[PDB]
Amino acid sequence: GVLYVGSKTKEGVVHGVATVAEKTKEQVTNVGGAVVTGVTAVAQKTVEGAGSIAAATGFVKK
Amino acid sequence: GVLYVGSKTKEGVVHGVATVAEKTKEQVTNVGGAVVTGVTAVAQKTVEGAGSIAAATGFVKK
Amino acid sequence: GVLYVGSKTKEGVVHGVATVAEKTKEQVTNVGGAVVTGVTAVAQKTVEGAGSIAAATGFVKK
Amino acid sequence: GVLYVGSKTKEGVVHGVATVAEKTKEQVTNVGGAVVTGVTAVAQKTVEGAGSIAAATGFVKK
Amino acid sequence: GVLYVGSKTKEGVVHGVATVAEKTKEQVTNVGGAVVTGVTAVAQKTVEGAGSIAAATGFVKK
Amino acid sequence: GVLYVGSKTKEGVVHGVATVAEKTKEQVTNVGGAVVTGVTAVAQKTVEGAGSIAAATGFVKK
């Protein structure tokens, strides 16, 4: 298996994750896991096996 | 298996994930997993096996 | 198996995921999984095996 | 002469003058004079006498 | 002469003059004169007499 | 002559003059004169007499 990623760019602008909140009561932000951000973003074999990547969030209010 | 990704761009702008909220009570944001963002984004074999990638979110309100 | 992705662009603008909410009570946002965003986005063999990629969301209100 | 302006508003949004141009050769913009913009805009006796308010524009191309 | 301006607002947003240009050769912008912008904009007796308010623009190209 | 301006606001946002230019050859911006910008903008007797307020702009290209 051969993976060749040849990139040739010029004046690139990248915004990976942008969250905006305003005038709320409860604000819970959960960003993570395998978030890859770049100008040449490569992600090979993120999970290889019985492993697990999770970004769960819990909210309990009685 | 050969994967060749030849990219040649100029003045590129990329916005991966953008969330906007305003005038709410409860605001829960959950971004993650295998979010790949770029100008040349490549993702090969994200899950190879019995593994799992999850971005679940729970909201319980009595 | 050979996968050749030859891209040649100029002045490209990409918006992957954009959510907007306003004047709500409960706002739950769940973005994730294998979200690939770019100018040359390639995704080969996202799930290879018995694995699973999930972006579930739960909302319980009594 | 009595001029009574009683205003009672809530969450107002006003856009006075908005010009958009794209992919032209010559772009001349001329905004002015007595341009009044607000949430409670009042304009009394703009010209009182022999005076003059002008927003002229000239374009000569041989 | 009595001019009463009673304003009572809440969460107001005002944009007076907004110009946008893109991909042109010549770009001349001329904003001025008696441009009044606010949340409670009042303009009384802008010109009182033989005076003059001008926002002229000239463009000569041979 | 009585001019009463009673303003009572809350969380106000004002943008007086906003110009945007991109990818041009010649860019001439001329903003001025009697540009009044505020949350409670009042302009009384801008020109009283034989005077003059000008915001002219000249562009000569042979």
Backbone φ and ψ of F58, nearest 5°: -120, 140
Contact F24, E27 (CB under 8 A): yes
Listing DSSP states for F4-62 in one string gives EEEEE-SS-EEEEEEEE--S-SEEEEEEEES-EESSS-EEE-SEESS-EEE--B--EE-
Q: How was this structure determined?
A: cryo-EM
B residues 21-40 lying closer than 8 A (beta carbon) to C? 21-40
D17-43 in b/e form (b: 16+ CB < 10 A) is: beeebeeeeebbbbbbbbbbbbbbbbb
Nearest residue to B12 via CA among B38, B30, B33: B38
Residue in D35, D47, D61, D62 to test binding to E, most E beta-carbons within 10 Å: D35
Residue in A2, A8, A13, A14 to test binding to B, most B beta-carbons within 10 Å: A14
Whether residue D38 and residue F33 make contact (CB cut-off 8 A), yes or no, is no
Question: What's the CA gap between E9 and C33, in Å, rounded?
Answer: 45
Structure's resolution in angstroms: 3.0
Question: What's the CA gap between A17 and A47, in Å, rounded?
Answer: 22
Backbone φ and ψ of D47, nearest 5°: -130, 120
| Distances, alpha carbon F39 to alpha carbons C29, C39, E4, in Å | 36, 43, 17
